[PDB]
Amino acid sequence: DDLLLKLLELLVEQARVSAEFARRQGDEKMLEEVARKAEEVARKAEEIARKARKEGNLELALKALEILVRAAHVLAEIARERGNEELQKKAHKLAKEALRQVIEIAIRAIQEGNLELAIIALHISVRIAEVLLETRPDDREEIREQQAIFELLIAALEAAIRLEKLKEEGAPPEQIERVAEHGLERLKEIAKEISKEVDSPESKRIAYKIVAAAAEFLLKILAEGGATPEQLERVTEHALEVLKEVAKELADSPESVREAVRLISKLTQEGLKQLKEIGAPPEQIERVAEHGLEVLKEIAKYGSKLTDSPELKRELYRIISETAKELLKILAEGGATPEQLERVTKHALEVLKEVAKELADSPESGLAALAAIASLAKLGLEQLKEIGAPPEQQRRVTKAGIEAVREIYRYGRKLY
Amino acid sequence: DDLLLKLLELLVEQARVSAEFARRQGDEKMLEEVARKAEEVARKAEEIARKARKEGNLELALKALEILVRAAHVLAEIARERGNEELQKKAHKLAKEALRQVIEIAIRAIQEGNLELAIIALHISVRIAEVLLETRPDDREEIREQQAIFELLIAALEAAIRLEKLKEEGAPPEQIERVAEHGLERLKEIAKEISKEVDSPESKRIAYKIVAAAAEFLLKILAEGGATPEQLERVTEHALEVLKEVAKELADSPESVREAVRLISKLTQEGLKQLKEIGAPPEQIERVAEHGLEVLKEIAKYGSKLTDSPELKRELYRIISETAKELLKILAEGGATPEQLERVTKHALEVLKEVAKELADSPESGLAALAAIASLAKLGLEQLKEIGAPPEQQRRVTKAGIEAVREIYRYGRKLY
Amino acid sequence: DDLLLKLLELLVEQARVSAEFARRQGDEKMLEEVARKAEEVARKAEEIARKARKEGNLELALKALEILVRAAHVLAEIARERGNEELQKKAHKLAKEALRQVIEIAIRAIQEGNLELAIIALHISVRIAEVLLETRPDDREEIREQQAIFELLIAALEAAIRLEKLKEEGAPPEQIERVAEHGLERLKEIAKEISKEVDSPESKRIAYKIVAAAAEFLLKILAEGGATPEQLERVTEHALEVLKEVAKELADSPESVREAVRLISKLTQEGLKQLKEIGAPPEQIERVAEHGLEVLKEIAKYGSKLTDSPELKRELYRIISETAKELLKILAEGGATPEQLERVTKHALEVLKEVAKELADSPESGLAALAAIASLAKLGLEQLKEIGAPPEQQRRVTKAGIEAVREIYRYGRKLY
16 A cells, blocks of 8 residues: 555645745646645545555554645645635645544554554644644634643653553552552543633543543553552552543533443443453452442433433443443353352342433333343343352342332333 | 765755855855865765666665755755856756656666655655756746656556556456556557647657656566466557557657667567567467567658658668567567468568668668668578478578568669 | 653644744743743753663664754744743753763764764754754854864764775775875874864864774774784874874863873773784784883873873873783783783883873872882782793892882982
């Protein structure tokens, strides 16, 4: 592929030189034709960039974005002197989209755990900032949002590199966890200040996603560092608590709540999977599971306060049920006893019951939630079946399931 | 070697920085001294560049050209603000020589087929264009000729990179052939429009060389791709036809014809070489040989109608005869039956006779043509002897030789 | 590692782009905040640069310096529009310190033989020159000193790369020596002209260090080139002689003598190491030893005119004695006869006596000179003991030592 990108660079640079020449000559027809070439080059680059995004070669994607930056610069240089607002609109929107895509790449680079790609991407984002700055210097809010995003990314990167070097240097876990907490606290404070600054929904969405990625990166490097599970658990709980606080600030929209749950659940699941891989005693696993479910429930409750969509409620509840199913599957893969599984299953059902009691407001949603509860009970009983649990355990869980179903039906009879 | 080039770079940059300083001081003596230093640095670079050209390291030559470009930039920048026309004339001429050399390198990069070298060369050609643009705001025509050349190189690269990828992807040879034709026909019509747009004989020479190289590359990549001989033959005809059409526009000077036939001969030689290498039946080879020879004949005629020089006529005859002799020698090395050898020998004698009938205007040119015909007969008889052909075939050939020589004398009898 | 500095690059770029935005907006508060941030970035960079200097990774050191120069550039670019003096004062001082450090690294890179590091250092020096030039274009003497240093480095590097090439080519050592001699003579004439231009003690100190390093490099490359010991000795004499000339021209301050002596001693040591490793006859070693000591005494004699510092005189005598001790150590490691040991030891005592006669001016300085020659006598006797020289040789040397002490006491009786 690289030849095509290099050709597009050659083309776009030629378009720049031809445009500077055409500006010296006053040739509006050449300017029009190179503007067409520049748009078509940008189209070729965009089409290739989506292909690179599909295949996951970040270097090519970033290079394609740099071509898009260069093409935007040429288009903007033309649009500036021509006064053509449709070119200015196109370039500005393309630059916004590039900023979005490079931010997504930056999040992905953090998620994959190589910081050099993120740094390069962030450099390209500063080029995007230069293009944006020449495009619209009066949108101080966009600039400041990009700066906030950048500042957060830099803060995350500073913690990331510091931690990565402490790991490579073989530092004592006590120093590491003090640094990690200081990182989380600083990130939280920065995010909290950013939440005072900004009002773009997408900026907040991005911000929380970055924070979540920063917590996940900490989790990854800390876990690869091989620290004793007690430290992993303590950092995890602090991270979940921070994530809950920062969500309680930043989340106030359909997508933000849905994504916040998706993130917190993902990070919970990841952390529990790390505890499973290190071979932690099930007591710690169960504490993380409960504390995670409690946090999730508190978030679900918080998010629900604004709500008017049964559809969002349905998907949220579905995600909560998927979370419970995943949690039980992790304990089962972890070789947990049926008595640990029933304790967890009971708490999970009780959380589901409480979350249904918060969320539910129609018979239709009541049925859907009930069906989810029932499906969880089915999977839970299927775990007890797979471990060959005594019939009393099966009866206990089944009765609890029936009782929860009955109580939710009593609430359903109040709603209907 | 590169350390010397690197010192020359930093010397150039120090000349730039010291020239900023000297302008800020008003130190005309320092400007004179650093201008001498920059000329001498350029002289070192020019000698090293010609050394690199002799050794065939394109990277060194290109880097040395970039040094020459940077050196020219500072020289021209000083000369412009000084009003020094001798330095301005030196810089423009040197930059034009650099443009020639980079174009030749770009053609060589197409010939060697590593398109990354062609990309790097093309990038340096953009740098040449930038310095030229800062040199000549007035000669927009020369700049536009360079742009046309660049656009042709770009078109060639679009075909080249498309084809390279299309064969990396292992596509149907027929789909490849449709793309290759679309490349050639687009290139040809572009070249025709370029032939209207430009007027420098050398620019047209360059353009034709590029077109020839584009066909040559397509042929080489297609043949290395293992496409069946029918595709090679079809493309070869189309390529010859293209070369013929563009030559019929461009054949306005002695060396233009000489080059045109040389390039047609090259394409023909590569054609037979690939048909030999793939193991095609001599049936295809002999058809292509006839095609190439008759195109050559019609071009040789056409160029002769546009021209008068005795030495050109002599050279054209010589080249045509050497071409025919080499093509017959290739067919004989290709192991074809004696029948194909005599068929081609007869056709070649007829071509040479027609060429004599077009060219000949002095007893000396008659004798030279006769001597060439005799040399062709000698080589033909030598190949019939080496394959051990029946004596009747040998006699048939020498009789045809005498008959041709008789007809040459019957023409010459009008002049003598 | 590098990523830390890359974050600093991002912060620098961000500081620039935000400061250009803040200049479009009139945001004095942002300018103040980013200026503080840029100073803190420079603080981070300075500490990292000290760490790199300690670890001796020159690639990192040069990277860190370049990024420091970038940080200085943005700091100055902000301070210029602000009209702030203290930032300009800081930047100018820091840039001079960076120039000093990069020059030291350039000397070290000449020592470590990979001239690409010296080229990168030289590139950074040109970047420093741009920063200095945009900082204070009226401080022309500093710029001209940097130019003199650059010119000297260029002269050295041109000889260096020429020798590297002739050595790699396998040129006859006589031609290499002719080139090296011409290099040294050219370097001396340059150093003379530099000494006619400059008056900064540090500039002369740097200059002489560079000259000494150039001779040292020439010696090392010629020795690696396998030249016969006679050529090494002839070059060594020319080197000592030219080092003496340039030292005498440049030196008018205390540490300059101490360093000059140290450098001459180093070049003497390196020469003796070559003759020892190649297995030269001790006759050549004894010539080099005498010639070095003779020159050292000429320099010590010259230097004695410049100051009354007792500490300096004691240091010079100390270094002279260390030189004699090292010379004996090398001669003994060379397996030379007790006759060579007495020949050299006698000269060593005598040149020490001359050095005492020139330098000493007090009872305390007499006792120091005495103490040193007595220490030399102790080592000399220890060498004659370790080689197992016959008691008569031990006694002959011991009496000569006592007589040197007697002569020193004859002077001591006039000093007290």
